[PDB]
């Protein structure tokens, strides 16, 4: 149903617009709210719009900096935070409610949007490849979060295990991923892991 | 209006778990409970009175008395270990307000040894003066481990960054450790003393 | 015994076949009513969702203002 725009990096003082295209019903009978979650902390309700009426209510910590808008022609609600500081670095959620008349709870959520507020440079990733047997993949010296490793451009699920990234003292991230196969499926299928670092917009593969 | 939850709650499997949500006037039907496993979006489990969205197990119950709402879980399973939030709407300002959240920790999770893998530098890397070592640590509990290094029989202090453990795909924990090198160092000798709960394990080749 | 039995059979077929027809036209009014009823059902459910949405809208409006 809900799907939000990609992760982003914003310089301190900049602005950011986050989209959230809904799908699967009448858009004017929706109610929307924007919830954010700082890394490691709980959820924080920012605002709420009802597309039918075309106006918003904001939590007073956000009054002025945040602007929310829907767009019935595109079935999409927007969140825009301005005057950015590092305490706004969080995953931003699109959350719809009033699934039914008496359901005031947020029934549907988006996937989330990792917004990173940083005055540092966006460096791209450096990709290196790696009684059963199992192989892997490596992503090193990038910034910032996140990266998502795919396998075979989709054909995998039954044995994939992506690991969290390390934070070097240089201020860069390094990430690893692995899988599993029978040792009789060696030269049976050629393999490719897709590594996308959307902030720097890097789409690179690598075979083993 | 505000909502107070216990920061953490722990219970033994099979027995019920109760998470309280304290606030002044939490209207009535405006209340909600959400479940949030690690890297996911929250999941509405109970809304308003005692309503489960179609798809939520019957073991989840919602209750209210005075100023406290309470999510109840009959016969708690190990896969219910997650961060639980309550939320509502202000009857005055119509502001949405979340609780602090409650980490549910299901007890009795058996001790687990790490399934450790070690990958050496690649045939593409060392053509740029590096060269990088890894260390992959999967399926261990409790999630707490110190990774000691050995440059063949001798420890290494400098140049070691290792990740803090984190809740895995299942309910166990995982982590990883790093140490880059040079072609002026690698092709001239490694082990990985990953130590947790006594069971010290090492890898090579 | 007989004699009268001959005529009596005729009427207790006619009057009791016009009943058959009388019945099939009732079952047809029935299905048309069940139909119309379910339409009002979805009509009302669409109404109460809109109502609740507007009640919520005024709530947010007065707060944004007062």
């Amino acid at each position: 149903q809900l799907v939000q725009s990609g992760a982003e990096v914003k310089k301190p003082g900049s602005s950011v617009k986050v989209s959230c295209k809904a799908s699967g019903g009448t858009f004017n009978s929706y109610a929307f709210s924007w919830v954010r979650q700082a890394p490691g902390q709980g959820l924080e309700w920012m605002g709420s719009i009802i597309p039918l009426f075309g106006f918003v209510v904001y939590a007073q910590k956000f009054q002025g900096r945040v602007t929310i808008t829907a767009d019935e022609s595109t079935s999409t609600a927007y969140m825009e935070l301005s005057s950015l500081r590092s305490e706004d670095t969080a995953v931003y959620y699109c959350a719809r409610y009033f699934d039914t008349y008496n359901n005031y709870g947020f029934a549907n959520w988006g996937q989330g949007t990792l917004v990173t507020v940083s005055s540092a440079s966006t460096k791209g990733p450096s990709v290196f490849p790696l009684g059963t047997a199992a192989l892997g993949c490596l992503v090193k010296d990038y910034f910032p979060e996140p990266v998502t490793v795919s396998w075979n451009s989709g054909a995998l699920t039954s044995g994939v295990h992506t690991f969290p990234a390390v934070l070097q003292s240089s201020g860069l991230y390094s990430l690893s991923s692995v899988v599993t196969v029978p040792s009789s499926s060696l030269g049976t299928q050629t393999y490719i892991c897709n590594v996308n670092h959307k902030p720097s917009n890097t789409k690179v593969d690598k075979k083993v | 209006i505000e909502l107070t939850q216990p920061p953490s709650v722990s219970v033994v499997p099979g027995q019920t778990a109760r998470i309280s949500c304290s606030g002044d006037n939490i209207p009535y039907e405006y209340a909600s409970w959400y479940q949030q496993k690690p890297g996911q979006a929250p999941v509405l489990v109970i809304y308003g009175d005692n309503n489960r969205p179609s798809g939520i197990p019957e073991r989840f119950s919602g209750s209210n008395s005075g100023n406290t709402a309470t999510l109840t879980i009959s016969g708690t399973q190990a896969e219910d270990e997650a961060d639980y939030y309550c939320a509502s709407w202000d009857s005055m300002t119509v502001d949405g307000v979340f609780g602090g959240g409650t980490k549910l920790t299901v007890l009795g999770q058996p001790k687990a040894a790490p399934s450790v893998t070690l990958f050496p530098p690649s045939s593409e890397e060392l053509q740029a003066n590096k060269a990088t070592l890894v260390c992959l640590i999967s399926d261990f509990y409790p999630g707490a481990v110190t990774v000691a290094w050995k440059a063949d029989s001798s420890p290494v202090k400098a140049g070691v960054e290792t990740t803090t453990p984190s809740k895995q795909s299942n309910n166990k924990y995982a982590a990883s450790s790093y140490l880059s090198l040079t072609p002026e160092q690698w092709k001239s000798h490694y082990s990985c003393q990953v130590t947790h709960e006594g069971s010290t394990v090492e890898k090579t080749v | 015994c007989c004699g009268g039995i001959k005529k009596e059979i005729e009427a207790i077929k006619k009057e009791q076949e016009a009943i058959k027809k009388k019945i099939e036209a009732i079952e047809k009014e029935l299905s048309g009513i069940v139909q119309q009823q379910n339409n009002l059902l979805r009509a009302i459910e669409a109404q109460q969702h809109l109502l609740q949405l507007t009640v919520w809208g005024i709530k947010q409006l007065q707060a944004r203002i007062l």
Side-chain angles (χ1 to χ4, degrees), chain A residues 37 103-104 106 129 161 169 176, chain B residues 36 47 89 122 161 168 178:
Chain A
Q37 187 173 23
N103 182 18
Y104 295 98
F106 303 110
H161 212 276
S169 61
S176 304
Chain B
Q36 202 191 41
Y47 71 87
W89 301 92
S122 307
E161 264 132 6
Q168 225 166 346
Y178 291 87

Side-chain angles (χ1 to χ4, degrees), chain A residues 28-31 48 50 52-53 55-58 63 97-101 104, chain C residues 45-46 48-64:
Chain A
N28 268 7
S29 68
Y30 287 166
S48 173
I50 309 234
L52 173 67
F53 298 116
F55 78 92
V56 205
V57 156
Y58 306 109
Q63 206 100 37
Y97 58 109
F98 281 112
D99 194 79
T100 26
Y101 80 102
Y104 295 98
Chain C
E45 297 184 24
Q48 69 168 355
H49 179 88
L50 225 203
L51 236 177
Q52 194 83 333
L53 209 50
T54 61
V55 175
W56 200 254
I58 302 169
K59 272 186 146 305
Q60 291 190 344
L61 227 192
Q62 67 87 199
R64 178 104 147 98

Side-chain angles (χ1 to χ4, degrees), chain B residues 7-87:
Chain B
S8 213
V9 169
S10 303
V11 86
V12 143
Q15 262 297 332
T16 64
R18 291 171 185 80
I19 310 190
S20 77
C21 191
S22 172
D24 189 47
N25 179 224
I26 314 171
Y28 262 158
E29 287 193 13
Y30 293 13
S32 314
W33 287 96
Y34 310 92
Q35 180 188 75
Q36 202 191 41
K37 283 158 186 172
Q40 297 176 347
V43 187
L44 176 81
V45 291
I46 252 92
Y47 71 87
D49 185 22
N50 183 210
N51 317 284
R52 305 178 306 262
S54 196
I56 302 294
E58 302 170 46
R59 62 170 177 260
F60 288 81
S61 33
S63 350
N64 177 79
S65 64
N67 300 296
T68 290
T70 298
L71 182 69
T72 332
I73 303 183
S74 68
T76 304
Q77 303 289 266
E79 66 267 14
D80 292 343
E81 169 164 343
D83 257 87
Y84 291 84
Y85 296 89
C86 71

